Amino acid sequence: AYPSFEAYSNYKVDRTDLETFLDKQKEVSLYYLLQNIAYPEGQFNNGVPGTVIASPSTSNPDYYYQWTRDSAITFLTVLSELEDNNFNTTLAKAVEYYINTSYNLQRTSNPSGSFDDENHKGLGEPKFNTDGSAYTGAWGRPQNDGPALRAYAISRYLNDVNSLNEGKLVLTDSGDINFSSTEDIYKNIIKPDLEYVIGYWDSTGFDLWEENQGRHFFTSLVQQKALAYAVDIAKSFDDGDFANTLSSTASTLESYLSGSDGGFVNTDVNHIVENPDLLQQNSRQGLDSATYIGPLLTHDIGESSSTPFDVDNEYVLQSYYLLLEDNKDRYSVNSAYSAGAAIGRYPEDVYNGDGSSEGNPWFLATAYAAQVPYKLAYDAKSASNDITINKINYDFFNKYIVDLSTINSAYQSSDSVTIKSGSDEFNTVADNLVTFGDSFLQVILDHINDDGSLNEQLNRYTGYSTGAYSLTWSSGALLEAIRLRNKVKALA
Ligand SMILES: C[C@H]1O[C@H](O[C@H]2[C@H](O)[C@@H](O)[C@@H](O[C@H]3[C@H](O)[C@@H](O)[C@H](O)O[C@@H]3CO)O[C@@H]2CO)[C@H](O)[C@@H](O)[C@@H]1N[C@H]1C=C(CO)[C@@H](O)[C@H](O)[C@H]1O
Ligand SMILES: C[C@H]1O[C@H](O[C@H]2[C@H](O)[C@@H](O)[C@@H](O[C@H]3[C@H](O)[C@@H](O)[C@H](O)O[C@@H]3CO)O[C@@H]2CO)[C@H](O)[C@@H](O)[C@@H]1N[C@H]1C=C(CO)[C@@H](O)[C@H](O)[C@H]1O
Ligand code: NA
Ligand code: NA
């Protein structure tokens, strides 16, 4: 049940009309995303401002909590909207309430620890109650992705304040508020998260799915991003030695991610092994949608981020392809899909959304799967960069994107194919990438609730939605897929 949920229902979903669907969901999913964020000017005006619920579901399952990860990812979408709107005050107030509530959560002692522990050990805590209190039940803690994603989101807000609002914050005359300046946000909210990442990146915690302990590609990747992105922020506040500490630590994490210490790049199977310790344990073979979700989050389309493992990385792209192939056989709901399909978390998954039996495809993983080919095309076209296709990825391209032999008949004799910007071959591949991306959004259209809200999961047999209702992260993932689709299609 989800008693606080309010439906929009401002249109009848037509499952035969993708273009119209995506036009309407650009607004409907934003409505549902914002509904789960507490702010005085919003629908959720009775919660502590800055609290993001993962879902209005309070039973079967009970997701009425604030997770550091979901809240940060939610705010990355809010920030994308804020940026597209040339800095909307309403949204900026929501971001600042979230920054303030994050300040309070950071200082809340919990089962992972406290703020005054070494490098703020308490910041590893995955979730809190909506009233701001510590969640004291058993849980897969700590999770070291949260502080990284939050540091990144709040850093990005500061860059936006400086670039789009002439350095001006919007809530600094409110009583509730634990900052008076951008420097206060950096020193007292961003920097503690960065100190946590510096202190704990190479320690044991749970993955983003809250289930396994050890090395995790997504976690290390979002940590590397937060550190790299904060370098210039630190420099801007005359925090130069710390800026260089961030730079060196980011470089160290980049080497970790790319080498045999991390264990993520696996040249036996030529794809990323998301959780290398589980490969060692023989419990999972390493395919995971987090492998491509992370790259998407750490290379936001405005930024031209140079951080490692963008979606063009051959190992990331092969994990994507192989998970797609797996899931097209595993889930009966996918049996008639010729192109994209409903994608889950990992092939070994047993979480059904409210217990254990068999795992399902997830709306968020499916929406992120659309973004992969959209971003390949966008990156190339927007920068006039070549598309380079490594031999590891020839099967993927030949199955879904292009007959490579029509590009270069001798492709099998080369380690790669490079397709020059502006060529007919390039336009063919870019266009075919977008068509392929669209097929994943069609899967969403096939199975979305009539009210336009997205659950956590869709049943692997029937495609009916299941698990947590109107999941904020589902809404965000779809919103970012639509934003990317529109941006790539708008390119001349
Ligand atoms: C919400 C979450 O749920 C499932 O995992 C939970 C359990 O439901 C929960 O009982 C608790 O499990 C412990 C258990 O009760 C106890 O017997 C034992 O000693 O140890 C357990 C903790 O290790 O904790 C876990 C979470 O650690 C799933 O397995 C999860 O995948 C699931 N995560 C979802 C939900 C959200 C919120 O939107 C996302 O942030 C997240 O990425 C997601 O995968
Ligand atoms: C309008 C409706 O559409 C969506 O439902 C889909 C499925 O997602 C989809 O997989 C497909 O279902 C078939 C399925 O593959 C298989 O199990 C079985 O063989 O038969 C199905 C084909 O007859 O087809 C339907 C579309 O007909 C959504 O998933 C739904 O949420 C949606 N609305 C339903 C659901 C509800 C409440 O859950 C009602 O409020 C409503 O009246 C109804 O239309
Ligand atoms: Na104040
Ligand atoms: Na890139």
* H/E element sequence: HEHHEHHHHEEHHHHEHHEHEEH
Rounded to an integer in angstroms, the radius of gyration calculated over CA atoms is 21 Å
Characterize the overall form. Answer: globular
The strand count comes to: 8
CATH-defined architecture? Alpha/alpha barrel
| Separate helix tally | 15
**SSE class:** mainly alpha
Distance between the termini: 46 Å
CATH topology: Glycosyltransferase
Strand content: under 5%
InterPro entries: 6-hairpin_glycosidase_sf (IPR008928), 6hp_glycosidase-like_sf (IPR012341), GH15-like (IPR011613), Glucoamylase (IPR000165), Glucoamylase_active_site (IPR046966)
Glycosylation sites: 88, 100, 178
GO molecular function: glucan 1,4-alpha-glucosidase activity
Catalytic activity: Hydrolysis of terminal (1->4)-linked alpha-D-glucose residues successively from non-reducing ends of the chains with release of beta-D-glucose
Give a quick set of tags describing it.
monomer, 492 residues, mainly alpha, Glycosyltransferase, two-stranded antiparallel sheet, 15 helices, 8 strands, 4% strand, globular, binds a molecule of 3 linked components (GLC-GLC-AC1), binds sodium ion, hydrolase
